[model samples]
Target: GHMQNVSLRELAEKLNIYIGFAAINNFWSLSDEEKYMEVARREFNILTPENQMKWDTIHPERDRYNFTPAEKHVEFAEENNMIVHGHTLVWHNQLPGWITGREWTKEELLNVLEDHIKTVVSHFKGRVKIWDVVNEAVSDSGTYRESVWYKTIGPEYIEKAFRWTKEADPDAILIYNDYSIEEINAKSNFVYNMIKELKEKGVPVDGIGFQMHIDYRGLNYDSFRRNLERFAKLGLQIYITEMDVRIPLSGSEDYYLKKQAEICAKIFDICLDNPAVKAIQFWGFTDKYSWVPGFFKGYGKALLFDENYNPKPCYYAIKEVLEKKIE
Candidate 1:
């Protein structure tokens, strides 16, 4: 007798997900050959180049630029017919050791920012369509991070990043990507004000991305709805570019997974209802490989797939939503 064989790849394709990778390009466990092969066969799109395409990886000491990994990534995308999502020409994290530790004067920092953005963006000029131009620039409390970028380049660094990216890739969509924005606060306010200013000033900014890393317990959907609406009203494209709902630290594993499924379904409903959200991408596909374990301590099981890459409740919940057909 013949049997039905369903898999995540089939499920994603059936749902018309327009498949993409969140952080697959930078996983340390995979070798160069392994990474290339995986991208060739599995991914429909890619996101990265800035995180892994940074001064640290490309030019760790400020003089040496290594294009080995970055070039290979681009080649894999080209070969596989994947759309490359260029993340961040500038950001606060994963910065070079030299750039951060030194106490550079304001003038020097401006030069560095300008040079870095131009060089990185120019390399992949025509290939990349979307760019997370600036990442995590605003704080949770709505103030600029006192990072080395801000400290040396002052607030003008933000404007320069957006402007420079536009110059580098005149056609690519530029996005201001960040975590949170779940409610009205200093952080969200900061984004609102900046985007508003950019638009009013005739800046070429095209979109914004809310990193929807949510918790399974006590989610605030009402606030999330309101926040997306407020941003959408600004005439900006909103993307749920990073989303994951995890269980509590001490909850029953199975129960938490079910709850995750329920919450994800509700959130997906809200996102689908809102016309502004163009994409809803999870941080990772499976709980087994989640970064929360080592980073968030006592937290795990956030994704929709299990260790063996089997579909969990979270996966089914998403399936129910997408599987529905309109009359």
Candidate 2:
């Protein structure tokens, strides 16, 4: 246990770096909702709603919208004076039935896509200042995934999405978010080139949200640094959008936890050295309600806090990087 401590967000503020976490609605119904919110506000200064703001959840039907959860997310951020990072506007997954239920012509799909982007962006115009305009267009092997959005509208969809988002909220910072590209590999290379060309052509993309869903073993820190520096050269704001260092199930408790802690800090160490890296956010802050254990079989405890709201070793590890106070 930590003998003395300071708040994480407070230290990050000194560096002008926003420490954030994905706010999960799955835990909102818990009797300990206040407990979750308490740690969230205490440790983080920015937030991304896990699934509440996604397409299928926010706009389940075309005409019939569900703004309740989305509203709740923004309102809470407003009350807490925290920055809200919008999860996504144009993701292939989590499409509503109204969109994927039937195929439409190119012209028809364009109108639908524009309508969705503009409508959502307009609703949260000033409050949600940052948005993932497009998500996961590039596959892990460095090819376009051929998602419904890609197939129907082609890669042109990404440029159009950014353009429409800018139209709705001119000042909103637009980001292209993706997974498995936190290093200098095929995927990151593709993403780098893609963003570079978009920028060259005057596309409205402003940043890259590197969804850092990685693990503690065999990490290539230098490659990640190179990838980050490469993107920074393109003059794009870099955000570690969805970070969670998933750990193996079997291990010496002390040995494995310390490794997880070190890996977490190393990521912070890497990002801090680069000025272009603006913020560092976790996929979720606590393991209690993490999406990890369910999806990532036999690998979890992948957060700053453990179950029961105790700050884990990784929390202190990150705090060491951010904390400058004598306490």
Candidate 3:
């Protein structure tokens, strides 16, 4: 069985979506050479090479910077008519061991941080359109995560990182992206408050991203809408940066498809209503390669298309939405 839906170019044409966000892990298992060639052929309009651009890859040494893998991503995206997104300029996870291994004074840490943003952003200034400038460092609760970042540099790290990113790539769209914002949760409220405050002050922020990684069993469309309006009210652009509604394998095929389609409609309706959300990217087209499986064991059916590349009920749900909007 093959997953035809894995082809971003074909899926883009069918869904009338102008942008596509490729899942890096799908090809991470392959040799670097093969992976590059495979992505070059996909021709996705946007690329997010997750984990490759994080602190671990960029600042493997204290004062050093590496660009092999990240540059490889940009080259592939450029060759295939795609734009690159620096998956993350700053984040808590996937960072090198050294960053967290020892403690450093505020002055030293800030210098290191400044150097990282300057070098990396300067390398690909005009080529990259969007940068995950800062990610998941702030929890849904307005407080910074209790990670090495907050401990070493304190809460100001978030503000400083965003400021540095803007300085590094003035033209790039710096995004504050995080997961699990589709529904009302305590963490979501915290994030909203922080973003709203920044937005009201006319901060250098250009956009907000809701990772929209939902749980099939417990998704709330109403809460999703409320949050979307909450952030949009701040006069900032929003995006369903990573859109996917997971559905479990229920008793009958028909039953599962219907449920999937219904949930899909609930989400698309809100995204359609909010024109500020310029792009809605499914994490990956096919469930065959979704991270939900490896990371969340015993879970399956986590995306728009199934393992065989066959359209599920959710597929038609979105298809109808696109058709209605396009007409």
Candidate 4:
């Protein structure tokens, strides 16, 4: 049986969870690849643009702004009865040349940053349900990353970004998104403290996104659950953003594939038990389109589907996890 025919959307609806995938902007225009689009529409109920909605694509220049790609993505999602989750609003990477190519004063850069957030948020206000307002602001060691925003605008940049986003779209859910913080570590602690302070200060934060990019080992699922529980106690929603378990190409193919499936199952088990989790999104669905192979050498096949659109063991693992109810 083809996994495309499995209807992950239906499976997710049964458990009241949203399943999503990272889609390329040009995918909607590729008429010859309708099979791929069909699979995406049937399997997932939410769409996240891989790079279309980023600062580089949206604000290519200080004066020039392009919303064509993002508009098309939102249109496609709406037509398919799906919702759009904007990939990011502020990220240190994928920044346009104009902003990063030169230096600026504190006032100059802060004005530019606020305008960027307000303009982008206002443009797709009602359409995009959620936005990653600030991304990767904290480093792996639990300190500020010293990005352009932090160095020039200061640590309060995060709170200011969320405030501006709220002003632009009061209904949209604002999230602080980051990677490498799935387990209870220093990085995770930094995020926890920041969220705690934001709540105490009455910031407009609505959620936290854990970009759970993991490998065959090093995942503490119990700690992951506890971390999510603490955040949920803060009354903030939790999301498993950019989740993909990469397996090194060493060991028997069957052995590693099973390991990936087991890892995926454990993650799903944890996410499902925590009702605060609103959605679970894969970085991408098929290995043919995964960024892992090109981004990380000797690491690939991190998704649930093969290049030929066949379902792998990871797909069944999620299916089984979603099938069981915690009692």
lDDT (tens digit, per residue) of candidate 2 on 1-327: 853546888788888888888888855677889899888887788889998889998888887668789888887877887899998898888888888899887788899889889889998899997899999999868998888888887789889999999999999999999988988888888988998999999998899999888876936999989888889899999999999988887777677789999998888888988999888999989888788889898889889888988988998888887764223
In the range 26-54, model 3's lDDT, one tens digit per residue, is 35345444544454355357777756777
- Whole-model lDDT per candidate: 0.72, 0.87, 0.71, 0.87
lDDT digits (tens) for residues 99-136 of candidate 4: 99998888998899889998999999899998999989
**Poorest lDDT segment (10 consecutive residues) of candidate 4:** 1-10
Model 3 TM-score on a 0 to 1 scale: 0.84
Q: Candidate 1 — which residues are off by over 4 angstroms? A: 1-19, 25-46, 325-327
Overlapping backbone residue pairs in candidate 2 total 0
Which 10 successive residues of model 2 have the least lDDT summed? Answer: 318-327
Candidate 2 scores a C-alpha RMSD against the true structure in Å of 2.4
Model 1 pairs whose backbones collide: 142-186, 142-187
Residue pairs with clashing backbones, model 4 = none
lDDT of 1 at 114: 82
- lDDT, candidate 1, 29-116, per-residue tens: 4544454345324633444442467566866767666767777667766776655777777888777888878889988888888888
